Structures are given as C-alpha cells and as structure tokens.
Amino acid sequence: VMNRLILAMDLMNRDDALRVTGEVREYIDTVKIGYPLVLSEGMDIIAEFRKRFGCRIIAGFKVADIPETNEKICRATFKAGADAIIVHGFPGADSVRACLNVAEEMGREVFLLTEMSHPGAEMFIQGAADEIARMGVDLGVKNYVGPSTRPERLSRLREIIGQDSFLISPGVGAQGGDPGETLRFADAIIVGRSIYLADNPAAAAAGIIESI
Amino acid sequence: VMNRLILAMDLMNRDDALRVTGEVREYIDTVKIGYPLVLSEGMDIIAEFRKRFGCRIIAGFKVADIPETNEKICRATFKAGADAIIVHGFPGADSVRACLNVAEEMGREVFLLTEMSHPGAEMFIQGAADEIARMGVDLGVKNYVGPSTRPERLSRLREIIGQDSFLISPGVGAQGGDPGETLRFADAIIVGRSIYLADNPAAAAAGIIESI
Ligand SMILES: O=c1cnn([C@@H]2O[C@H](COP(=O)(O)O)[C@@H](O)[C@H]2O)c(=O)[nH]1
Ligand SMILES: O=c1cnn([C@@H]2O[C@H](COP(=O)(O)O)[C@@H](O)[C@H]2O)c(=O)[nH]1
C-alpha cells in the first residue's frame, strides 16, 4: 500500500470522515472502514469512498460468527464494494473457510486476524494466536493482521506465515505501537486516531511517513 | 487514475506483460487487460496483476452478447478479480442491463463503450453512438469509453453524459489520437502500443505524462 500506511477511518460522521480522508489521500491508497463509520452512515459509504478517493477498502469487521452467518456478512460486504474483509480466527477453521469461500466466489480477499493489539488480547487470544496463524497457513490464507504493540509477537507471527504473506498491523500511535519497529515485521501499518484526531491529519500522516 | 493514464496491456506472453507493467507502474495505477492477454495466459492473470502491482484492473472485453451470456461473462470476470468491465452498447439496453445487474450484485463497475476509435467505427457505430450514450444515461451508467481519434465526437459524448460521469478514451498514440487534446474531454486516456512496444516503456509513459 502507498507509503506502507493504511488509514483506519473510525470517525462516525460522513462529513468529517470524507474531510480527513481527502486531506491525507496523497499519503495513502488504502483505507480500513469499520463498524464505527458503517453503523452510523450505512454500507453505501464503502462505494462512496472507493469512488471518490480511488482507494482500496478493507472492511474491518472482525467477523466472528458461525459459518452460515459469516458467509452472509462477507457476501453483503463484498456486494458493497469492499476489496477485503478482516475475519477473526479464534472462532475456528470452519468459520474462516466460510469467509474464504465467499471471497473466492467474488474475487476478493480475506485478512485473518491472529493476535489483537489491546491489553485484553493477552487474556485468551495471545495463547491461541500462533495456532490461529498456523490454521491460516493450512487454509491457504495469504493476508494477516498482527499487533504493533508487541513486536516480538509480530516477529513470531511473521515466522509462521512466511515472507510471502502480507501482514498488516494496528496499534500504532494511540495504542503505543511504533511505526518503524512495526514495519521491521509487518508490510503495512494501520493508523487511526494519531491521524484522524490530529489538529492537522495531513501533517500527522506526513510525520509518520517521514519517521519511516 | 494516476496521471490520468491507463495502460492497455495487450502483450500476449505473461513474462513480457509483467515486465512492461512493472516498469511503468510508477506512472499508472490502472491497467486494462483484454482478450489478447487473457486468452493466451488465462483469467488468473487478472488476480496476479492486481496483487503484484496493486493496480485496479479494467477487463477490456467488449461484451457484446445476449443478456444471458453477458451475465455469465460478467460473473466470471468479476469472480476473477476485475474491478470493472467494458461492455458494448450497440447490442441494446437489455444486454447492457444484464451487465449492470451483475456489477451491482458483485460491487463492481461497468464501462459503456459508445463510439470506437478505429476507422471502421464510422460505418455503423458512429451513427448510433449518441443514442448509445443517452441509453447509458437512462440506465444509470456512470462510466463511458469514447474515441481519442475524434475529439469532436468525444466532446459531443461528454455533452450527453455530463461532467460527473467518468470517461476514458483509447486510440492515443498508435491510432493517431493526441493525449492533451483527448484529455480536454476525457478523464483518462488509454494507451497500449505507444508504451508496450516502445524500446523504453517507462520513458514512453513518462513522455506522455510530461506532454500533459
Ligand atoms: O488488534 C487489533 C485489530 N484491529 N484494530 C483496529 O485498528 C484500528 C486502530 O485504530 P487506532 O490507530 O486509532 O488505535 C481500529 O479501527 C481498531 O478497531 C486494533 O486497534 N487492534
Ligand atoms: O474504440 C476502442 C475501444 N477499445 N480499444 C482498445 O484499447 C486499446 C488501445 O490500444 P493501442 O493504444 O495500442 O491502440 C486496445 O486494447 C484496444 O482493443 C481501442 O483501441 N478502441
């Protein structure tokens, strides 16, 4: 992705979301849109962003349901225009395979979330993360999400998935993660608040890029 | 699209196609892949390009069949990962609507080809082109293709579709069209041979961009 930087656009109002995204567009080419924006403004916001900014859109939906429901969620998400969707691996292989089947049908991609970046991720997710990553490899997953806040875990995850897999990483900035250290292991970093809550989002994005 | 320039990648061998596309990637972000490459190397080449270069892919398939067959062609094309497909308008509204229905189902886009750029287009297509463009407007089409070789026709087509519609234009270079004149009316130009048959494709792309 452009400058190895993905904007997590979690503002809830369409006007502010469009303003900030347009201001930092020259520094990115990929935007992660999640439920904070979609549940407030509707799924049509995905196609609007894709058209207006010509950026790739990752739907950050943390899909975590049974196979049947996961299939419906992925179908609606790709119908809305998303290029990829993030799915949790903790609910198991069948739930991930359901997402992979819809992505195959629709010519889209699935990103498998292994370990999360927040403190609570240490409680249960961390202990299952290496196995979730290996499950991904077994299922043919080529895109993964891992934590900026724990570079030693990001290193181990990179070890499991290999150098050819694409790995993106949130938790940079607000959560404590460092851009440069994270990029020693991840292909791209996801940044939300450090950019969208800044007084000057473009200057904030430019600063991150210059730091790396 | 980047630099308002779309590469028409009509080389037939995968190695040469990948070489040239990689060499000019910094000047573009959108590649038109058609049957010369797909029929020689397979539909999987679309996903390969999309992944390797991170570019948007327009399938230049000139869809021109009955509704039922058009639906199947569009479904296979979007399943293969194409972001958009070019469809002929001369076979009529039902044939175009079939493509629009699949694009809606799959969160993709249809480009309507109005008038073609080659000499033979004057025989039958030109006389129907204004009506084909109006049909597009009536059907809700927002993306169009018009001829670089006839800027007065491109102007009339732009008049019919409005300023908000996206218009791309082939026939630049080899066929005689001029980049700058074409861009007075079209949003982007499509260039094939002037770039891919050049001794230095990157220098050729750079020259076109500098000329505009
Ligand atoms: O382990 C994970 C997975 N996903 N995200 C998501 O990535 C973004 C990070 O935003 P931030 O830069 O504002 O912390 C948000 O959309 C958040 O839901 C995390 O923060 N951590
Ligand atoms: O009216 C049209 C529609 N499509 N194309 C396509 O656009 C590309 C133009 O290539 P060129 O720059 O080598 O002439 C080729 O893929 C060709 O099939 C035209 O040339 N003219």
Residue ranges of E strands in B38-184: 56-63, 84-88, 109-113, 143-145, 166-169
Q: Do B105 and A79 touch (CB under 8 A)?
A: yes
Phi then psi dihedrals of residue B49, to 5 deg: -65, -45
Angle at B147 between CA B204 and CA B103, to 5 degrees: 95
Chain A touched by B190 (CB under 8 Å): no
Catalytic residue among A32, A51, A62, A72: A62
Give the rounded distance of the alpha carbon of B155 from its chain centre: 18
C-alpha distance from B98 to closest chain A C-alpha (Å): 16
Residue nearest to atom 1 of ligand 1 (CA): A116
Q: Chain A window 49-78: which residues touch B at a Cβ cutoff of 8 Å?
A: 54, 56, 78
* Cα B8 to middle of ligand 2, angstroms: 7
For the CA of A9, the nearest ligand: 1
Please identify which residue in the block is written with the tokens 């939300």: A192
For B78, the closest of A80, A104, A107 (CB atoms) is A107
For the CA of B116, the nearest ligand: 2
Residue nearest to atom 19 of ligand 2 (CA): B170
Asked if B27 contacts B20 with a C-beta cutoff of 8 angstroms, the reply is: no
Q: Do B54 and A29 touch (CB under 8 A)?
A: yes
Pairing of β A188-191 and β B166-169: unpaired
Residue ranges of E strands in B72-170: 84-88, 109-113, 143-145, 166-169
Burial of B147 (0-12, 13-18, 19+ CB in 10 A): buried
Asked if B203 contacts B211 with a C-beta cutoff of 8 angstroms, the reply is: no
* Beta bridge pairs of residue B167: B144
Contact residues on chain A for B106, CB-CB shorter than 8 A: 78-79, 106-107
Instruction: Give this entry's resolution in angstroms.
Output: 1.5
Residue B127 CB: number of other CB atoms within 10 A? 11
Locate B120 and state its tokens. Answer: 């033979």
d(CA A2, CA A30): 7
DSSP-derived 3-state class of residue A172: strand
Q: How far is CA B132 from CA B73, B127, B150, in A?
A: 21, 10, 17
Chain A touched by B106 (CB under 8 Å): yes
Best residue of B100, B108, B187 to probe chain A, by most A CBs closer than 10 Å: B108
Contacts of A59 (CB under 8 A, 6+ apart): A32, A33, A34, A38, A46, A77, A80, A82, A84, A85, A86
Contacts of A196 (CB under 8 A, 6+ apart): A7, A8, A9, A10, A11, A20
The Cβ-side half-sphere exposure at B27, using a 13 Å CA radius, reads 24
Angle at B165 between CA B122 and CA A46, to 5 degrees: 140
The superfamily in CATH containing domain B1-212 is Aldolase class I (3.20.20.70)
Locate A36 and state its tokens. Answer: 């904070």
d(CA B172, CA B149): 7
d(CA B156, CA B71): 30
Contact residues on chain B for A108, CB-CB shorter than 8 A: 81
Locate A1 and state its tokens. Answer: 């992705």
d(CA A155, CA A171): 15
Asked if A143 contacts A174 with a C-beta cutoff of 8 angstroms, the reply is: no
d(CA B80, CA B47): 6
Query: Which are the catalytic amino acids of B?
Result: 62
Chain B residue with Cα closest to A54: B1
C-alpha distance from A90 to closest chain B C-alpha (Å): 27
